[PDB]
């Protein structure tokens, strides 16, 4: 029955959203959208109350429950699946860890005497004695099979990893700050599943995804944060699209009315100024110009990064040579033989529902995971560029934005010709003097597009490129690969990116891996 309040935040130069003043409450789900690298994730991170803003407008509601799914979908490879879901209850988790230091403590103290009783009575009061079982039924209820309940999250497919992480959020909370960009789970089947779960649950939830269609079926209000602040536009998404791109147009027309009215008062002032009979009237509109004050126009953060990949040697005959792969981790092998040939092109969109091993195919196609195969036989002068599905080991050791980008080069100069490439994809002068690990989402992805700019990889992979991009970098990336000369073997989950971009399909289903149907406008047409 309560609502949230206002905040204001800044991570350095040019503060971000500058005195937001909004309220979220009721049952309506405020779909929060915005360009890459602008508020959004960190705006509602403040809303969760774990970190406080700079200007400190404060937004308090400390009585009810908040459950938050975040963007770091791989932030726990260690905790078992049952532990991650239980940890969604913050009070239960922190109590248990200090309680669990019983069998790990060989000697007990006097003050520990009632302390262990004090923690145990709190455990029973919030009934932690059923948390493992309470989560298990819910965990089974979202589609995770029993046999992987006790397994580690390292050995769970990222598409499945969202189903666990949504179960963590759903812990009887009447609001959820969903950072859910349904990146990995875009099977349409799983997407359609997540649309039913959220729609038929009554909560004052917030959704942040970039999927235009997904926001239609679920969200009722939109909270675009584009120029310097967030404005709430009711309507789904395409009733929004008119107003947001019309209120801008009506401002440019109003702004250009004054700029054309001033320029016509300057006709009188510049003509009848020295005149003795008309001077008192020209100085009546010479001081009327000084009272118009046309309102300033700010630039939208929804810019279009300009990326293009160019070759270095351009092999001519063919790239791939796979005889028989027969790779399986701990169950029935995900593929049997997979005889493959690329023939210098054939952008080879790998497909399939999540959890069938398309990412483990690419990982062993590049030679990281050793298969029981007989080698993959790269070409004579292949320069492989890799964009892994998960990319977090690269962004470590606290290098800066300029530092991280700099080492990747072969002949270009260190000061210029890498600032331009790094700055071409929307990195301002003050944005490159901060650690490269503090970047967020699309900027992490945009770095790996820039990484292949200077590298000039003759052969490309791009495991899952269109994950966190902001619907404009996707249009740029789709255009960048379209005129690309060379070979790339990508696996994408959405339809339009695969359909428009050149393709030679290789779908993976147990057990036969269907190879080739042409345009992917015919692959579905054959069905």
């Amino acid at each position: 029955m309560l609502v949230s309040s206002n905040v204001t935040m800044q991570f350095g130069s040019k503060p971000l959203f500058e005195n937001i003043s909004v309220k979220f409450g009721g049952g309506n789900r405020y779909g929060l959208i915005g360009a890459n690298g602008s508020g959004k994730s960190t705006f509602m991170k403040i809303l969760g109350g774990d970190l406080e803003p700079t200007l400190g407008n404060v937004s308090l509601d400390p009585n009810e429950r908040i459950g938050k799914l975040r963007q770091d979908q791989f932030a726990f490879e260690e905790f078992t699946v049952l532990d991650t879901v239980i940890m969604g209850h913050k009070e239960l988790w922190e109590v248990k860890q200090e309680r669990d230091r019983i069998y790990a403590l060989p000697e007990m103290s006097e003050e520990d005497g009632y302390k262990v009783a004090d923690l145990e009575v709190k455990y029973g009061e919030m009934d932690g004695y059923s948390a493992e079982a309470r989560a298990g039924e819910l965990l089974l209820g979202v589609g995770i099979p029993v046999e992987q309940h006790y397994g580690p999250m390292s050995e769970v497919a990222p598409g499945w990893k969202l189903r666990v992480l949504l179960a963590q959020a759903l812990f009887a909370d009447p609001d959820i700050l969903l950072l859910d960009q349904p990146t990995n789970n875009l099977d349409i089947d799983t997407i359609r599943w997540l649309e039913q779960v959220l729609n038929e649950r009554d909560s004052t939830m917030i959704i942040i995804s970039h999927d235009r269609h997904f926001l239609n079926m679920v969200c009722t209000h939109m909270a675009d944060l584009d120029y310097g602040e967030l404005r709430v536009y009711p309507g789904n998404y395409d009733e929004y699209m008119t107003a947001a791109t019309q209120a801008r147009e009506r401002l440019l027309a109003d702004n250009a009315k004054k700029k054309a009215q001033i320029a016509e008062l300057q006709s009188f002032v510049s003509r009848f100024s020295a005149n003795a009979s008309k001077s008192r009237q020209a100085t009546s509109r010479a001081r009327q110009i000084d009272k118009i004050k046309l309102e300033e126009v700010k630039a939208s953060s929804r810019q279009n990064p300009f990326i293009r990949f160019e070759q270095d040697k351009k092999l001519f005959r063919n790239a791939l040579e796979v005889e028989g792969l027969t790779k399986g981790f701990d169950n029935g092998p995900l593929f049997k033989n997979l005889n493959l040939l690329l023939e210098v092109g054939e952008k080879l969109a790998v497909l399939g529902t999540n959890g069938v091993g398309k990412s483990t195919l690419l990982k062993t196609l590049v030679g990281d995971l050793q298969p029981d195969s007989g080698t993959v036989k790269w070409s004579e002068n292949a320069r492989i560029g890799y964009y892994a599905q998960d990319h977090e080991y690269e962004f470590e050791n606290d290098l800066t934005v300029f530092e991280w980008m700099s080492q990747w080069k072969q002949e270009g100069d260190d000061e210029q010709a890498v600032r331009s490439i790094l700055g071409r994809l929307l990195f301002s002068q003050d944005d490159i003097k901060k650690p490269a690990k503090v970047l967020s989402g699309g900027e992490k992805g945009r770095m790996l597009f820039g990484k292949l700019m200077m590298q000039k990889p003759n052969i490309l992979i791009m495991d899952q490129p269109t994950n966190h991009l902001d619907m404009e970098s996707i249009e740029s990336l789709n255009m960048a690969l379209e005129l690309y000369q060379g070979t790339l073997i990508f696996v994408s989950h959405d339809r339009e990116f695969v359909s428009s971009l050149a393709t030679r399909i290789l779908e993976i289903t147990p057990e036969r891996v269907i190879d080739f149907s042409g345009n992917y406008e015919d692959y579905l047409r054959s069905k």
């Binding site: 800044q10 350095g12 130069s13």
Partner: protein
């Protein structure tokens, strides 16, 4: 201009602050100087605030 006003609130618990200016665009991190607190009559640390 681009230089705005801050206050260094003491750490000795008492309410005392030296007010200065600091450029935020170049450096967005806090300021830590050991200054004099006349309320307790000692040199203590003054973390930036406001």
């Amino acid at each position: 201009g681009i230089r705005e006003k801050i206050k260094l609130v003491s750490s000795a618990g008492t309410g005392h602050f030296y007010t200065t200016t600091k450029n935020k665009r170049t450096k967005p991190e806090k300021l830590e100087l050991k200054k004099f607190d006349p309320v307790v009559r000692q040199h203590v640390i003054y973390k930036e605030a406001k």
